[PDB]
Amino acid sequence: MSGKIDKILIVGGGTAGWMAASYLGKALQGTADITLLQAPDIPTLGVGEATIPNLQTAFFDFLGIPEDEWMRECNASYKVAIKFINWRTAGEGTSEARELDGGPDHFYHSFGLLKYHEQIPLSHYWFDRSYRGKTVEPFDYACYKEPVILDANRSPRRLDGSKVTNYAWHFDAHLVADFLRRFATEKLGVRHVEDRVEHVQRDANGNIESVRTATGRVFDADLFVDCSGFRGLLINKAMEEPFLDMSDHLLNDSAVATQVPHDDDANGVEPFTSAIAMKSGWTWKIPMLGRFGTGYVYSSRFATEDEAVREFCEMWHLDPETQPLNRIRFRVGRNRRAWVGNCVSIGTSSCFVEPLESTGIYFVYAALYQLVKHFPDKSLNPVLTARFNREIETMFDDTRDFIQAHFYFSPRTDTPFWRANKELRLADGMQEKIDMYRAGMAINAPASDDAQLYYGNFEEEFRNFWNNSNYYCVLAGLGLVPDAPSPRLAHMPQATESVDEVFGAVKDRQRNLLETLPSLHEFLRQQH
Amino acid sequence: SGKIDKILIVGGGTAGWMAASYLGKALQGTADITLLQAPDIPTLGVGEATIPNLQTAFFDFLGIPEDEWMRECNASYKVAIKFINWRTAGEGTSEARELDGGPDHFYHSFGLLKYHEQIPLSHYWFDRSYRGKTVEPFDYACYKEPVILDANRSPRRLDGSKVTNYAWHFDAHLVADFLRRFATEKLGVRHVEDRVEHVQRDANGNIESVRTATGRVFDADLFVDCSGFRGLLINKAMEEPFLDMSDHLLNDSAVATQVPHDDDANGVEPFTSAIAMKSGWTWKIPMLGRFGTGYVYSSRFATEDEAVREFCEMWHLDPETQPLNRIRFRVGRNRRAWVGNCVSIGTSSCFVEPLESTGIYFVYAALYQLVKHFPDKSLNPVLTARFNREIETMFDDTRDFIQAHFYFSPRTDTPFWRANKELRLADGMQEKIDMYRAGMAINAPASDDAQLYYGNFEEEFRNFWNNSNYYCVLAGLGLVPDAPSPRLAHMPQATESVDEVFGAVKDRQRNLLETLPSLHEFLRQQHG
Ligand SMILES: N[C@@H](Cc1c[nH]c2ccccc12)C(=O)O
Ligand SMILES: N[C@@H](Cc1c[nH]c2ccccc12)C(=O)O
């Protein structure tokens, strides 16, 4: 028919489902009846979720929820960066960084944007100096103030509350989902129904007419949102939309995870997520309050589930026979089309990639934002659907490419896994970026180096999600550098001379913040 | 292999001297630049219209104040392009015909449509227009400019304060002269007045040297072709094919002149006029005490004599005595703007009728990209390929936008107008139209802050033709969405509170109309 969408049914009630319910409930408030169908699942351990800055500005701010309100109810901690440990040295899976060129084998991928100097990213000046032997300091320590304060577990905020850097959050997803469930049902009028989908009825146009549950209830709506996770109950099962496996770019498809109690008083809390390289994958460490979530993401192609359990438990000194563990098999890739007919997939039902760069939750609300932007009426204009699908496919594929580069450019050749990664091919779009990088060009340089604008305007960030800063942190961090300095620098003697103070400013902030900032633990004590 | 040491620019018109200035400034003291230009019959100052970033991206880069160059170039101000008679049948006249109770004209002003609850004002306007809530045209409802332009107001108060975004009108010859003085006197650019007779290339196909009529031989590491439509280096020497694009643009000729004007009796129009004709359109570019004008037409629909006649008749000029410039130009772009060690800048690179004042912009936009992708003597292929991609998109998007001005005109009164409707829009442009009809914005700006936009070239270049521009032209011509944006039916609070936004515009139109001095008034002061 025609007329606006009157009823929406969300199938699936986890993080994605209740985020969808909250975002749509907020966006269409009072002009659409929303029902979320939810069936009980086997409970799992809170193994932790890491996020990015726009979670607050693009999601919680949109809902009208203050950082302090949701943080306290979700027992959240702070994330200032992802610390990559042992990606450049051979060896077993260990929590301790090995030695590399006189220092621990780690590098940071921090938030924020590299400063521009005479229209050129600081990255280019750093490399120019490194290349000409004027420096041996790593890219991250030279261009970011964060590495130094993170090495000392400092808080991203002073005791008086003032923030000194861009940061995100670490939390148990289950708590956020419960928080949102209460918010959506209590504040936004979303209807929660506890039932299991038994049958999906489609019409002759291939659209979903209704969903019938195991109790015999029939739920019809104008638009259906699939938040059923890997099963893709609607988008794949009912709509039969093909899923594109991308194991030709990503070898990791499994994980063994758990949660470990932690004495924050004795050891403090790390203001960062750790990405610890393993023999057949990598392990995440996500610090929360009084405990940390950790999971070994690996490739079933190079390690059996039991070998992964052993490697994982031994690294944390846990009993492989008694430790509570979540054994997961991921569905890596994306649907050929995220939205088909009147069925929009949101969450893992849509796409999934290992949490190497904290994009899981981002993918959920980035998509919800794109859905509302391309919101249809009952005629389901195909142009809205196609453009939405294009945005989603690009969002995922760029991430897929970026993550693959973490493994493709690691210098490690010590296990079949690391060696195999180098035998895969990068997508053409990614290879073009590397060609540009090697030629000394910036990759997706931000329009402005103003981080407040970037993280404060979703449209601005979504169009430049993976920017030059991100690419340099990871590529240079791993050891991939340009074949030679940007040739235009040889024509800018005054700029390459005055940049001295730009590097000096970072050094002063590194020193000042290190001497004045409280530890993350200290701040959390006062705060929570 | 060493930096670029010598640069030879062939051609000394507007493009050539802008190249010498920009490059002389950008590479100051690190490259020797010589501009080689032949002396030949100058043309009439038929006038050139520009856009806001001419100052922020070009003159500001050179370190030249707006006051300094515009007074030495006797320039006037441009606040918009006024399209006249594009919707009504008839002969080519300077007077707007009547349409729906008013004159047949619409404005394409500078600046950005304001965002209301994350949605461009254009969408709220159409929603109301579509629901019979209003009959006011898009431009008058969403822009303050239209009514002050109708009264020939100045973009700045007598005290100098700026009340709107504006650009300039000037005789290009004067600007070229100014830049020649600047580059030679202040940037050390060597000027040689001679004619190229022979271009010698090496075994790699790169240019080795150029020999002149007097027997002089000039060598360089990089050659900039600013020879105009001849493409002496890029097309003739390097043999790079020029790609004609008359399958999108029928206009390929023009008859132009300069007409004396009594500013005291008539004031000065703060806008460029684009007057629809029987087989093309005519530009009117107001300057000091005169205006440049030219009939752009299609040689396949009107003869040179017919064009001269139609043109002279509208301005009441005598065909037999009025000095006239008759030109037949090539429309399109080179397959590649930069090949080997030869970079084309200006009309030697590409050209499209001046319907949206992009001619000069194309020059410094390309110069900006050349410096960003500046090579050393090894001429890294990647830098060249990327530069070329930037140029082709810059041009093709403009080509598409201009074609739409003709394709969507409602006129069917002459072979020309009817023939435009039988051409094919490029796939990319068709997708944009599909989106537009679906109620979607086309290239919405990341922010509605015009200052960020016009103050940051990277920002504008990535979003050069934005939703504001498409709505001005498409809606102006009468092409509107099939229905309102489906989103608005879900935002009652937004659609209610938007009247305050429309009201704010109304107050601005009122106050400015009442308080602003006429353009002529301001011009007397700022100039005389
Ligand atoms: N645009 C994202 C990029 C990003 C994703 N994951 C990250 C992890 C660490 C640092 C940056 C990122 C941001 O700046 O937030
Ligand atoms: N980004 C350009 C768009 C543009 C080109 N030519 C124009 C003519 C009129 C109005 C806008 C334009 C600007 O706003 O300057």
What are the phi and psi torsion angles at A425 (to 5°)? Answer: -105, 145
Q: Which residues from chain B sit within 8 angstroms of residue A376, using beta carbons?
A: 486
**Burial of A29 per CB tally in 10 Å (0-12, 13-18, 19+):** middle
The identity of residue B210, as a single letter, is V
CA B381 to chain centre: 30
Rounded CA-CA distance B138/B109 in Å is 12
- What single-letter DSSP state applies at residue B488? G
Cβ–Cβ contact A376 with B under 8 A = yes
Q: Which residues from chain A sit within 8 angstroms of residue B459, using beta carbons?
A: 447-448
Residues ≥6 apart with Cβ < 8 Å to B111: B143, B145, B164, B165, B450, B468
Q: What is the resolution of this structure in A?
A: 2.1
Rounded CA-CA distance A274/A415 in Å is 21
Contact call for residues A306 and A269 (beta carbons, < 8 A): no
Sign of the alpha-carbon torsion through B239, B245, B246, B252: negative
Q: At what angle do helices B359-372 and B381-407 cross, to 10 degrees?
A: 160
Strands (E), A140-186: 168-171
Question: C-alpha distances in angstroms, B204 versus B7, B147, B208, B341, B343?
Answer: 19, 59, 10, 10, 16
Contact call for residues B397 and B469 (beta carbons, < 8 A): no
Contacts 24+ apart (CB under 8 A), B378-382: B378/B1, B379/B206, B379/B340, B379/B341, B380/A439, B380/A487, B382/A435, B382/A436, B382/A438, B382/A439, B382/A441
Contact call for residues B474 and B410 (beta carbons, < 8 A): no
Contact call for residues B169 and B48 (beta carbons, < 8 A): yes
Neighbours of B451 (CB within 10 A): 12
Contact call for residues A231 and A225 (beta carbons, < 8 A): no
Does B83 contact ligand 2 (Cβ within 6 A)? no
Name the strands in the sheet holding B242-244, side by side, starting at the edge strand that comes first in the sequence: B242-244, B332-334, B350-351
Rounded CA-CA distance B283/B254 in Å is 10
Neighbours of A130 (CB within 10 A): 19
Q: Which two tokens stand for residue B285?
A: 């570019």
Cβ–Cβ contact B6 with A under 8 A = no
Contact call for residues A438 and A483 (beta carbons, < 8 A): yes
Neighbours of B37 (CB within 10 A): 21
- What single-letter DSSP state applies at residue A245? E
**Burial of A76 per CB tally in 10 Å (0-12, 13-18, 19+):** buried
Residues ≥6 apart with Cβ < 8 Å to A317: none
Going by the annotation, the residues of the binding site of B for L-tryptophan are 356, 453-454, 460, 464
The identity of residue A104, as a single letter, is P
Which position has the token pair 């002459």? B414
CA A349 to chain centre: 16
Contact call for residues B147 and B137 (beta carbons, < 8 A): no
Contact call for residues A199 and A212 (beta carbons, < 8 A): yes
Question: C-alpha distances in angstroms, A397 versus A79, A468, B201?
Answer: 25, 17, 44
Q: Which two tokens stand for residue A424?
A: 């895969």
Does A82 contact ligand 1 (Cβ within 6 A)? yes
Cβ–Cβ contact A434 with B under 8 A = no
Candidate of A52, A108, A274 to mutate for ligand 1, largest count of ligand atoms within 8 Å of Cβ: A52
Contact call for residues B70 and B48 (beta carbons, < 8 A): no
Does B360 contact ligand 2 (Cβ within 6 A)? no
Rounded CA-CA distance A83/A103 in Å is 14
Residue A223: which of A387, A462, A365, A31 has the closest Cα?
A31
Rounded CA-CA distance A123/A127 in Å is 6
Sign of the alpha-carbon torsion through A463, A467, A471, A474: negative
Contact call for residues B391 and A504 (beta carbons, < 8 A): no
Residue A407: which of A285, A286, A256, A297 has the closest Cα?
A297
What are the phi and psi torsion angles at B105 (to 5°)? Answer: -155, 155
**Burial of B76 per CB tally in 10 Å (0-12, 13-18, 19+):** buried
Contact call for residues B20 and B9 (beta carbons, < 8 A): yes
Rounded CA-CA distance A302/A300 in Å is 5
Q: What is the DSSP string of A326-363?
A: EEEE---EEES-SEETTEEE-STTTEE--GGGS-HHHH
Q: Hey, whose CA ends up nearest to atom 14 of ligand 1?
A: A111
H helix count then E strand count, chain B: 19, 26
Question: C-alpha distances in angstroms, B276 versus A316, B91, B398?
Answer: 77, 9, 19
Rounded CA-CA distance A490/B251 in Å is 44
Residues ≥6 apart with Cβ < 8 Å to B424: B247, B248
Helices (H), A188-280: 264-267
> To 5 degrees, how large is the angle CA A383–CA A389–CA A394?
130
CA B195 to chain centre: 30
Residues ≥6 apart with Cβ < 8 Å to A369: A23, A58, A458, A462
Residue A152: which of A514, A506, A509 has the closest Cα?
A514
Residues ≥6 apart with Cβ < 8 Å to B520: B152, B263, B264, B267, B268
Residue B92 DSSP SS3: coil
**Burial of B381 per CB tally in 10 Å (0-12, 13-18, 19+):** exposed
Question: From the CA of B417, how many Å to the nearest CA of chain A?
Answer: 29
Which position has the token pair 């929570």? A528
What is the Å distance from ligand 1's center to B465 Cα?
A: 29
Question: Which residue of chain A has the CA closest to B460?
Answer: A447
Q: Is B273 left (phi over 0), alpha (psi -120 to 50) or beta?
A: beta
CA B50 to chain centre: 6
Contact A4 B459 (CB under 8 A): no
Residue B262 DSSP SS3: coil
Contact call for residues A302 and A423 (beta carbons, < 8 A): no
Fold category of B1-528 in CATH: FAD/NAD(P)-binding domain (3.50.50)
Contact call for residues B20 and B183 (beta carbons, < 8 A): yes
Q: What is the DSSP string of A445-509?
A: --S-S-HHHHHH-HHHHHTTSS-HHHHHHHHHHHT---SS--GGGGG-HHHHHHTHHHHHHHHHH
Q: Which residues from chain B sit within 8 angstroms of residue A436, using beta carbons?
A: 382, 386
Q: What is the DSSP string of B132-159?
A: TS----HHHHH-SHHHHHTTTB-SB-TT
Taking every pair of Cα atoms in chain B, the longest distance, rounded to a whole number of angstroms, is: 77
Residue A57: which of A455, A373, A446, A448 has the closest Cα?
A455
Contact B382 A435 (CB under 8 A): yes
Q: Give the closest ligand to the alpha carbon of residue B79.
A: 2
Neighbours of A223 (CB within 10 A): 26
Strands (E), B310-358: 325-328, 332-334, 338-339, 342-344, 350-351
Residues ≥6 apart with Cβ < 8 Å to B528: none
Residue B456: which of B368, B521, B391 has the closest Cα?
B368
Rounded CA-CA distance B173/B43 in Å is 9
Rounded CA-CA distance A126/A135 in Å is 8
Contact call for residues A282 and A341 (beta carbons, < 8 A): no
- What single-letter DSSP state applies at residue A229? G
Residue B288 DSSP SS3: coil
Rounded CA-CA distance A267/A309 in Å is 26
Cβ–Cβ contact A452 with B under 8 A = no
The identity of residue B27, as a single letter, is L
Rounded to the nearest 10°, the torsion over CA B485, B487, B491, B497 is -30
Rounded CA-CA distance A337/A242 in Å is 8
> To 5 degrees, how large is the angle CA A388–CA A390–CA A393?
110
Going by the annotation, the residues of the binding site of B are 12, 14-15, 38, 40, 48-49, 196, 347, 356, 358-360, 453-454, 460, 464
What are the phi and psi torsion angles at B351 (to 5°)? Answer: -160, 145
Contact call for residues B7 and B345 (beta carbons, < 8 A): no
**Burial of B236 per CB tally in 10 Å (0-12, 13-18, 19+):** middle
Taking every pair of Cα atoms in chain A, the longest distance, rounded to a whole number of angstroms, is: 77
Contact A31 B434 (CB under 8 A): no
Which position has the token pair 């590098």? A107
Annotated catalytic sites of A, by residue? 79
Q: What is the DSSP string of A389-439?
A: HHHHHHHHHHHHHHHHHHHHT----SSHHHHHHTTS---HHHHHHHHHHHT
Which position has the token pair 């062939």? B10
Contact call for residues A347 and A16 (beta carbons, < 8 A): yes
Residues ≥6 apart with Cβ < 8 Å to A350: A226, A235, A334, A335, A338, A363, A367, A392
Per 3-state DSSP, chain A is made up of helix, strand and coil in percentages (nearest 5) of 40, 20, 40
Q: At what angle do helices B121-130 and B492-515 cross, to 10 degrees?
A: 100
What are the phi and psi torsion angles at A326 (to 5°)? Answer: -105, 115
Residue A25: which of A73, A75, A63, A76 has the closest Cα?
A63
Contact call for residues B284 and B46 (beta carbons, < 8 A): no
Rounded CA-CA distance B79/B94 in Å is 19
Contact call for residues A336 and A244 (beta carbons, < 8 A): yes
Rounded CA-CA distance A253/A236 in Å is 19
Rounded CA-CA distance B45/A417 in Å is 69
